[PDB]
Design a protein around this ligand. Structure first.
Ligand SMILES: [Mg+2]
Ligand SMILES: [Mg+2]
Ligand SMILES: [Mg+2]
Ligand SMILES: [Mg+2]
Ligand SMILES: [Mg+2]
Ligand SMILES: [Mg+2]
Ligand SMILES: [Mg+2]
Ligand SMILES: [Mg+2]
Ligand SMILES: [Mg+2]
Ligand SMILES: [Mg+2]
Ligand SMILES: [Mg+2]
Ligand SMILES: [Mg+2]
Ligand SMILES: [Mg+2]
Ligand SMILES: [Mg+2]
Ligand SMILES: [Mg+2]
Ligand SMILES: [Mg+2]
Ligand SMILES: [Mg+2]
Ligand SMILES: [Mg+2]
Ligand SMILES: [Mg+2]
Ligand SMILES: [Mg+2]
Ligand SMILES: [Mg+2]
Ligand SMILES: [Mg+2]
Ligand SMILES: [Mg+2]
Ligand SMILES: [Mg+2]
Ligand SMILES: [Mg+2]
Ligand SMILES: [Mg+2]
Ligand SMILES: [Mg+2]
Ligand SMILES: [Mg+2]
Ligand SMILES: [Mg+2]
Ligand SMILES: [Zn+2]
Lengths: 81, 95, 155, 114, 23, 96, 125, 60
RNA sequence: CCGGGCACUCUAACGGGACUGCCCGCGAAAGCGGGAGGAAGGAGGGGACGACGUCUGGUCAGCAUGGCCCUUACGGCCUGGGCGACACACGUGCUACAAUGCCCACUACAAAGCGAUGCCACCCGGCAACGGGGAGCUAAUCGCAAAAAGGUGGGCCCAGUUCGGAUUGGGGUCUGCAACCCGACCCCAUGAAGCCGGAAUCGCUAGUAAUCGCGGAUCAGCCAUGCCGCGGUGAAUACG
């Protein structure tokens, strides 16, 4: 899915290619689950919204083509019974 | 199996198994009770309990109505029992 | 059929032997409206009915039909507290219908891989008095008989 | 064994017989009977092991394959169950993946019911 | 068959074209 | 060729005879009204405001076309037809 | 030279030309045998010709459009039947009681709302 | 969230995906017809009233 | 295809024809049986239409409307999540368990519809989805279009299989601002359950059921196997 273009919001895109430039920090809060994890993100802690909470995800080169939402899941399940 | 629908009401696991228990009375007749369905419902006068059940010899349908929910349910089973004894004994007039 | 009597349709005779009994049969072979299919089967079988046991496939067919039609059958009434299987004669209408039906039905239970062969063979044997169909006939007929004494509850 | 990732398929046609290997479908099958010019209708039984050794050698060296694949494959799940992943966290629960409803059905992924 | 994407009858039901039911 | 459109076919066919048989006197050779296949728009709608999906009434919209040809124009058939008796809706077409 | 009749069964129209000859028949530009191969109902709508004991008397030029092969046949039926009765209309007798003319009015029924296939209703409790 | 809704479908916002037919009479999003500008209910009322040009009970 | 023609087929507007009117038979009559002619007879088939009322049926969430309730909040905008959660239980349906079948390749015969920031001929790249170019059409005059089952002849040979296509791995396409949750399609690999189904239970009386494909609304796309239509092939049986 998604053929030619590589989709990152150009809102958190900006934020990552700044923090990397001067003295790289952490704690970037975002509500964009739609954003690809682009190799410039590799390592960081980004706070991703599942809709009631901003869930932090350490980035690793393990996961790149994915979306930032996949790692902050929307449902609290735990079981039945 | 047995399904219960609490319609426009907040019901509970405890009262659900109570209605499962009251319906158990029809097990007396030793005849298959097929996918029974009770519906509990409020009303300004009082509660309402409906049930519709099919058995090898026919189907049972009935409404209980009453102030107390529990006496409505009892009323429902009371009406159902009758219908069930009738499906079970009806042609015995076999002379 | 509350009201009057229910018409029995007549049937277009067939374009090979010009005989109604064949189309009824082909009708009974038919499945999901595919009639062309239902035809070749009967005729292919008719190839085979001549090929092996050289004869007149019409003859063989029309023979094994008379070898199937049940003369007497049970139809069960409730009297008092028991359901009696009751002896009654089958109408020529019903015998045809029961003839063709068991024929096919028993045909399709044969072990032969190709349908027309199954049709071929079942008919050849029924002509001779052997087979699933014929049994069902003799069977139905012994189940009548033995009930001869319920022949008074007869409509 | 016989051939390829060590299945053995005698007595039926070769385009089919090859399917009986992991990784080889009706698609990959028709390929290699072209590239080796072995004639797909010939049943394995009449091979000329010459053809067979040719058949083995291409298929064996070209893609991957019995016991591989499913090793390599499973490794992705062990990856995807490792990373985040959601669709990862769903293999971890033996639950369906591709967005099907879980309220009903879903029995292939859940097994018979109780 | 009608459910099997890899076949003619497959694609017909599904209303699409591909290698197995081409245009 | 003059094409006629519009919904009521009674209104239309009245003014297919008007226009055609007008230019019969004032022109020639007036190739008669030719009915085109009518384009139907069906609307099936659920009868009630609420559930009840098995009760519905069908509503259609009948838009029918007529073509009429006048062989030799005879300009001033381009006047006697440069107005005419309408009626209240219909679609006139003219081209060569 | 010629003899005409118009056949129809179920959204199908046959134009039949009874022009006299060997008995060759052409349907949409090829012999009966090429256009209906297989189908056994094809043996035929030619039945009207065998009805008045003429077999080869006439050839037939036939166009047929609409419906599908069987429907097309039954149209040819009232075709060669309507054409032949025109030729010598002492021909109604033995064609008519043999039920040859008289096109069957049996057609597909409208699908109705709330039902599925126009009669088959959906399942309930 | 209701009458504000009918207003929100009027001026056409950020993306064109967000376009959805509402209807002119009732603010109904569901079962709006493009050709009429109407819901299936509103459509019915008007048709029956005779206010829809050349629109008639079908019947074949 | 041109000339030429409206005979055809058709198209779509207006008429005709069926009346138990005619014969026999019965009846007190109404009317029933049978016959003739007729494309059609006994209401020719299907539709639209559905009494006074019933269910204190249904809908305040389509709309309206009395009354009660909330007024930096029970109002209003937004990003995101959810409405798709899954131990389970029921209802409607799809595809199947195969040889009257499955697959390939060639070859036929519809109807109703729908198309301008739409329907895309045809040419080319691509296994393909698709992507390039690019003609026609305000559309009986262009396009969606292929209808499908069927027909032909070839493979399969009873195998959980060349039955069935679930599930999953990986690679792509398109819509869209965006396909984590959550789209559809295409290709490769994977080929689950399922060998015809307990108690129980549904539909259909003829161009009907069964079976086969096609269109449309809504719609960017689409979770449509749904719904509303459309033709193709075409049965069984009704003593009662
Ligand atoms: Mg491979
Ligand atoms: Mg899904
Ligand atoms: Mg398959
Ligand atoms: Mg099928
Ligand atoms: Mg149909
Ligand atoms: Mg209808
Ligand atoms: Mg429904
Ligand atoms: Mg219902
Ligand atoms: Mg939208
Ligand atoms: Mg004329
Ligand atoms: Mg009336
Ligand atoms: Mg009430
Ligand atoms: Mg309101
Ligand atoms: Mg919002
Ligand atoms: Mg929902
Ligand atoms: Mg179940
Ligand atoms: Mg379904
Ligand atoms: Mg044109
Ligand atoms: Mg298996
Ligand atoms: Mg298989
Ligand atoms: Mg899949
Ligand atoms: Mg994948
Ligand atoms: Mg198994
Ligand atoms: Mg088997
Ligand atoms: Mg069954
Ligand atoms: Mg079956
Ligand atoms: Mg009826
Ligand atoms: Mg759509
Ligand atoms: Mg569809
Ligand atoms: Zn509205």
């Amino acid at each position: 899915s998604l053929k030619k273009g590589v989709f990152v919001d150009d809102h958190l895109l900006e934020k990552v290619l700044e923090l990397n430039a001067k003295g790289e920090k952490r704690l970037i809060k975002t509500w964009s689950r739609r954003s690809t994890i682009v190799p410039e993100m590799v390592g960081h802690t980004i706070a991703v919204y599942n809709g009631k909470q901003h869930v932090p995800v350490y980035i690793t080169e393990n996961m790149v083509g994915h979306k930032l939402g996949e790692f902050a899941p929307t449902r609290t399940y735990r079981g039945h019974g | 199996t047995m399904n219960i629908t609490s319609k426009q009401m907040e019901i509970t696991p405890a009262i659900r198994q109570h209605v499962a228990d009251r319906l158990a009375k029809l097990e007396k007749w030793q005849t298959h009770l097929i996918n029974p369905h009770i519906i509990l419902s409020k009303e300004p006068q009082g509660f309402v309990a409906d049930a519709t059940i099919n058995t090898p010899n026919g189907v049972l349908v009935a409404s209980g109505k009453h102030e107390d929910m529990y006496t409505a349910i009892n009323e429902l089973i009371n009406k159902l029992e009758r219908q069930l004894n009738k499906l079970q004994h009806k042609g015995e007039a076999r002379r | 059929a509350r009201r009057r009597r229910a018409e029995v349709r007549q049937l277009q005779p067939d374009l090979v032997y010009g005989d109604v009994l064949v189309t009824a049969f082909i009708n009974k072979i038919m499945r999901d409206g595919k009639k062309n299919l239902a035809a070749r089967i009967f005729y292919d079988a008719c190839k085979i009915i001549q090929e092996k046991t050289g004869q007149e496939p019409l003859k063989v067919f029309k023979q094994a039909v008379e070898n199937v039609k049940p003369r007497m059958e049970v139809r069960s009434r409730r009297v008092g507290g028991a359901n009696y299987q009751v002896p009654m004669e089958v109408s020529p209408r019903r015998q045809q219908s029961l003839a063709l039906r068991w024929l096919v039905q028993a045909a399709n239970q044969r072990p032969e891989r190709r349908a027309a062969v199954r049709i071929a063979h079942e008919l050849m044997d029924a002509a001779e008095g052997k087979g699933g169909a014929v049994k069902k006939k003799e069977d139905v007929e012994r189940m009548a008989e033995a009930n001869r004494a319920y022949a008074h509850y007869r409509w | 064994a016989r051939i390829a990732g060590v299945e053995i398929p005698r007595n039926k046609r070769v385009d089919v017989a090859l399917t009986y290997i992991y990784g080889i479908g009706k698609a990959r099958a028709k390929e290699a009977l072209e590239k080796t010019g072995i004639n797909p209708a010939t049943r394995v039984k009449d091979l000329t092991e010459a053809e067979v050794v040719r058949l083995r050698e291409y298929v064996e060296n070209t893609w991957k394959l019995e016991g591989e694949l499913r090793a390599e494959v499973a490794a992705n799940i062990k990856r995807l169950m490792d990373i985040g992943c959601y669709r990862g966290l769903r293999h971890r629960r033996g639950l369906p993946v591709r967005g099907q409803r879980t309220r009903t059905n879903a029995r292939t992924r859940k097994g018979p019911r109780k | 068959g009608k459910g099997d994407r890899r076949t003619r009858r497959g694609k017909i039901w599904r209303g699409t074209y591909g290698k197995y039911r081409p245009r | 060729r003059i094409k006629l459109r519009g919904f009521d076919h009674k209104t239309l066919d009245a003014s297919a005879q008007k226009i055609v048989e007008a230019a019969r006197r004032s022109g020639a050779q007036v190739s008669g009204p030719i009915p085109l296949p009518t384009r139907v728009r069906r609307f099936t709608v659920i009868r009630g405001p609420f559930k009840h999906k098995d009760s519905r009434e069908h509503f259609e919209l009948r838009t029918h076309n007529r073509l009429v040809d006048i062989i030799n124009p005879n300009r001033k058939t381009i006047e006697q037809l440069m107005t005419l008796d309408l009626p209240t809706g219909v679609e006139i077409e003219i081209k060569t | 030279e010629q003899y005409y009749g118009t056949g129809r069964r179920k959204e199908a129209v046959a134009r039949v030309f009874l022009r006299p000859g060997n008995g060759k028949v052409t349907v949409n530009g090829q012999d009966f045998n090429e256009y209906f191969q297989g189908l056994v109902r094809a043996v035929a709508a030619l039945e009207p010709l065998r009805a008045v004991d003429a077999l080869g008397h006439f050839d037939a030029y036939i166009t047929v459009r609409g419906g599908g092969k069987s429907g097309q046949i039954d149209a040819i039926k009232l075709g060669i039947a309507r054409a032949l009765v025109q030729y010598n209309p002492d021909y109604r007798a033995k064609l008519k009681p043999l039920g040859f003319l008289t096109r069957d009015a049996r057609v597909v029924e409208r699908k109705k709302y709330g039902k599925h296939k126009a009669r088959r209703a959906p399942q309930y409790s | 969230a209701r009458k504000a809704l009918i207003e929100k479908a009027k001026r056409t916002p950020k993306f064109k995906v967000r376009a959805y037919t509402r209807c002119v009479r009732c603010g109904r999003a569901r079962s709006v017809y493009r050709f009429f500008g109407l819901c299936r209910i509103c459509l019915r009322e008007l048709a029956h009233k005779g206010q829809l040009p050349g629109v008639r009970k079908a019947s074949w």
